[PDB]
């Protein structure tokens, strides 16, 4: 009678803490950090796929849509979770990848990818500024999974639009928990959805950085042909809340 049932179910299906399995007793090296991010990255993906299987409405979508949605949004889901952990565990002052893989300013600058750390750091800073709540976060994260579809749409297009509409209504309830006023709660909805709309740009920055990091690992045209649709505009269809 305080928190909505669906927001509480989201919190309960929230995956457990995931470790990177990184050894912090040894001096960092460009490769050991990249090796750990990839290990942690793969674990979190299995975690996302699993989390989705308990998401009301997801499994009812055609299996091909489930795959597509995960493919299109795993990067945004992960960078969003990164922001959330950074925001709550360390006041958005550092990047909290995992309990055993935290990078503060110094460690960022001296990590092989400092410019990528600042880009991702943007999300936690916003959280701090907006003082995002847990209920708001959970609803926002579901929307990220439902923020990009194929230019031709999905097989379960109607079912998909109805699922997304519910979580949009749920986000408003979450906002209503603290933002009582009609104009205020209306204003926060704008701030939170505007933020989500902004992730479309930041996300391709990350896919691009991912690909380049890969190019440098081995020193090919086919690998670059399947990555461009994740870093380039005009191949998928982002669902923006604001024109």
């Amino acid at each position: 009678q305080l928190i909505p049932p669906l927001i509480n179910l989201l919190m309960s299906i929230e995956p457990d803490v995931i470790y990177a399995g990184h050894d912090n007793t040894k001096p960092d090296t460009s490769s050991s950090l990249l090796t750990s991010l990839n290990q942690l990255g793969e674990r979190q993906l299995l975690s996302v796929v699993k989390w989705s299987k308990s998401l009301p409405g997801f499994r009812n979508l055609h299996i091909d849509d489930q795959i597509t949605l995960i493919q299109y949004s795993w990067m945004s889901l992960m960078v969003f979770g990164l922001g959330w952990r950074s925001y709550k565990h360390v006041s958005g002052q550092m990047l909290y990848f995992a309990p055993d893989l935290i990078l503060n300013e110094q460690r960022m600058k001296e990590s092989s990818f400092y410019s990528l750390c600042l880009t991702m750091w943007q999300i936690p800073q916003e959280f701090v500024k907006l003082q995002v709540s847990q209920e708001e976060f959970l609803c926002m994260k579901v929307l990220l999974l439902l923020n990009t579809i194929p230019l031709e749409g999905l097989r379960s297009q109607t079912q998909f639009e109805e699922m997304r509409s519910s979580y949009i209504r749920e986000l408003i309830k979450a906002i209503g928990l603290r933002q009582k006023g009609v104009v205020s709660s209306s204003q926060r909805f704008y701030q939170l959805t505007k933020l989500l709309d902004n992730l479309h740009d930041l996300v391709k920055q990350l896919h691009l950085y991912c690909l380049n990091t890969f190019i440098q690992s081995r020193a090919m045209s086919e690998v670059i042909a399947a990555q461009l649709p994740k870093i380039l505009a005009g191949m998928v269809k982002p669902l923006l809340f604001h024109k």
């Binding site: 793969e42 993906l45 299995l46 796929v49 699993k50 989705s52 299987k53 299996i63 489930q66 795959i67 995960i70 493919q71 795993w74």
Partner: peptide
């Protein structure tokens, strides 16, 4: 990853 996000869903 399409193969990974696929073997995971059907488990």
């Amino acid at each position: 990853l399409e193969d990974i996000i696929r073997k995971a869903l059907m488990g």
